[PDB]
RNA sequence: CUCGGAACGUUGCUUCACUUAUCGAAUGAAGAGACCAAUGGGUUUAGCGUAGUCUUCGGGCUAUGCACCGUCUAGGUUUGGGAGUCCCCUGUGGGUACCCAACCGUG
């Protein structure tokens, strides 16, 4: 009975989420690092275009 | 994992039972 | 390198 | 009809390179870790001549970066290379004739040779005797370097691609008249079976489009289409123009607006 | 070896591409503690062997 | 018959950015990237919250915070601290002049 309750929490009661959730689209560590570095380089290159 | 000091993989040597002399 | 280290330490004691 | 000579050569057979007595391909050393970060210092041990090549070749001895042994690379020697000269190859190599440096490290306006078209290709441009490339400019945003190739065309390459400082040795070879068919015979002995040359109009029509006729003549225009099949594509292939050039030689080759 | 390279590259291609929910649901497994409890119950009620039968 | 807009759902093309298909090189596939830290990952070492929104009432989902994954350095510059010149004879031999922190730098 406890096992049934536990597995229902993860799988049965979450049916709507499980039916809709797409997976994948995960970047590599090197790709994630490259994106982070690029954002840091171009961090504040647009401060002069802000009216405020 | 092991450590490989060579740039290409080569077949490891495994145990080889010798053939028996047939009648 | 040793000359720079001694000068840095001498400046430290001089400033303090 | 029969197969044209230009098509027959594609089969290989007796028209292949006379590679015997050649010392081997000439190249820069492998773009390894030492080149990408520091430098490798070698010594020029010998300057040697290879049949079929006008440029002199240099044997350069390096230590093996990972093993207790020597490497003994073989490169196209620039003009001025001498035995006992120290050759520096790497990111930190100084700007001097004979050294191999990444293009991004070389100042604009410098004269280079043994240029890598692709990083790590070990030298594919400006290799024939007396030839060189000129560094036009560097573009750090895209990491490219613009070069003037010996033919006059401008080409952009990655800045990590290497080049050798100087011009290829043995320049001025084509300035001396041959004066004899025999000298051409010896010239082509080390290259391939492509000499002497028989004109197409002197052949029979069975073996060449220009053959035959009661007068030695091409009876059709000699400018042929780019799309002509082999055997028909002889003469002036896809010529944009003909006749004596006057008022300036334009740069030949395909048009690359980039 | 080729089989080594392919089995690693297979995992990469499975993570880089877009996985539909039917296949993606199998990557969202039960937690470790509940998994151990479930397998303990399964082991307790394991089928009889050839000998015991 | 002619134009103006949503904001939803889908798309005929197309700019830019990307990388895993694919293609080109090079290498004895010999040193990639990060540690310098997200617009990342994580309930199978991640956890703690909060606010909405669902729940088969077990717990999720969406956001948003905090923490974990998560670690070090040559060299350059400046900030604190402690703690050990001598034999043989002017010359000779042996040896001591450090540690940590901050910024740049990136192996
Ligand atoms: Mg051949
Ligand atoms: Mg002739
Ligand atoms: Mg005849
Ligand atoms: Mg004909
Ligand atoms: Mg004719
Ligand atoms: Mg004539
Ligand atoms: Mg004629
Ligand atoms: Mg490799
Ligand atoms: Mg690196
Ligand atoms: Mg840092
Ligand atoms: Na005529």
Automatic annotation (TrEMBL), chain B:
Signal peptide boundaries: none
Superkingdom assignment: Eukaryota
Family under the similarity heading: Belongs to the universal ribosomal protein uL23 family.
Stated name of the protein: Putative 60S ribosomal protein L23a
Source organism per UniProt: Leishmania major
Residues of the full protein shown: 27 to 49 of 145
UniProtKB/TrEMBL annotation, chain C:
Top-rank taxon, per record: Eukaryota
Composition bias type Basic residues, residue spans: 2-16
Family from the record: Belongs to the eukaryotic ribosomal protein eL34 family.
Protein name according to UniProt: Putative 60S ribosomal protein L34
TrEMBL record, chain D:
Name of the protein described by the UniProt record: Putative 60S ribosomal protein L2
Binding positions (Mg(2+) 2): 216
A GO MF label: structural constituent of ribosome
Any GO BP annotation: cytoplasmic translation
Lineage: Eukaryota, Discoba, Euglenozoa, Kinetoplastea, Metakinetoplastina
Keywords: Metal-binding, Ribonucleoprotein, Ribosomal protein
Keyword Acyltransferase: no
Family annotation (InterPro entries): NA-bd_OB-fold, Rib_uL2_dom2, Ribosomal_uL2, Ribosomal_uL2_arc_euk, Ribosomal_uL2_C, Ribosomal_uL2_CS, Ribosomal_uL2_dom3, Ribosomal_uL2_RNA-bd_dom
UniProtKB/TrEMBL annotation, chain E:
Superkingdom: Eukaryota
The family this protein is said to belong to: Belongs to the eukaryotic ribosomal protein eL8 family.
Protein function: Component of the ribosome.
Protein name: 60S ribosomal protein L7a
Residues included from the entire protein: 54 to 106 of 264
Organism from which the protein derives: Leishmania major
């Amino acid at each position: 009975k406890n096992l049934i309750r536990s597995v229902n929490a993860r799988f049965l009661s979450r049916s709507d989420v499980i039916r809709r959730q797409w997976g994948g689209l995960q970047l590599s560590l090197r790709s994630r690092a490259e994106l982070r570095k690029k954002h840091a380089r171009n961090a504040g290159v647009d401060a002069a275009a802000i009216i405020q | 994992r092991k450590s490989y000091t060579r740039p290409q993989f080569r077949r490891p040597h495994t145990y080889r039972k010798p053939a028996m002399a047939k009648p | 390198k040793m000359k720079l280290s001694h000068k840095r330490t001498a400046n430290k004691k001089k400033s303090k | 009809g029969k197969t044209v000579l230009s098509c027959r050569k594609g089969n290989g057979s007796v028209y292949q390179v006379h590679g015997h007595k050649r010392l081997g391909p000439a190249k820069l050393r492998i773009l390894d870790y030492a080149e990408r970060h520091g430098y490798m210092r070698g010594v020029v041990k010998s300057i040697e001549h290879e049949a079929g090549r006008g440029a002199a070749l240099a044997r350069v001895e390096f230590r093996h970066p990972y093993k207790f042994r020597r490497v003994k690379e073989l490169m196209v020697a620039p003009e001025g290379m001498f035995t006992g000269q120290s050759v520096f190859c790497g990111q930190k190599a100084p700007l001097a004739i004979g050294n191999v440096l990444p293009l991004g490290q070389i100042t604009e306006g410098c004269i280079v040779c043994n240029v890598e078209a692709k990083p790590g290709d070990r030298g594919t441009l400006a290799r024939a005797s007396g030839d060189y490339c000129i560094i036009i400019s560097h573009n750090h945003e895209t990491g490219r370097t613009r070069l003037k190739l010996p033919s006059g065309q401008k080409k952009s390459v990655p800045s990590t691609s290497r080049a050798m400082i100087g011009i290829i040795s043995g320049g001025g070879r084509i300035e001396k008249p041959v004066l004899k068919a025999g000298n051409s015979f010896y010239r082509f002995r080390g290259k391939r079976n492509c000499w002497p040359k028989v004109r197409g109009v002197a052949r029979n029509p069975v073996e060449h489009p220009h053959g035959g006729g009661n007068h030695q003549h091409i009876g059709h225009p000699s400018t042929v289409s780019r799309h002509s099949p082999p055997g028909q594509k002889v003469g002036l292939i896809a010529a944009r123009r003909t006749g004596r050039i006057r008022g300036g030689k334009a740069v030949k080759g395909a048009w690359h607006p980039e | 070896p080729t089989f080594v390279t392919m089995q690693r590259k297979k995992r990469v291609l499975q993570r880089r591409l877009k996985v539909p929910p039917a296949l993606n649901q199998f990557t969202k497994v039960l937690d470790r503690a509940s998994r151990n409890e479930a397998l303990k119950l399964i082991k307790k009620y394991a089928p009889e062997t050839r000998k015991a039968r």
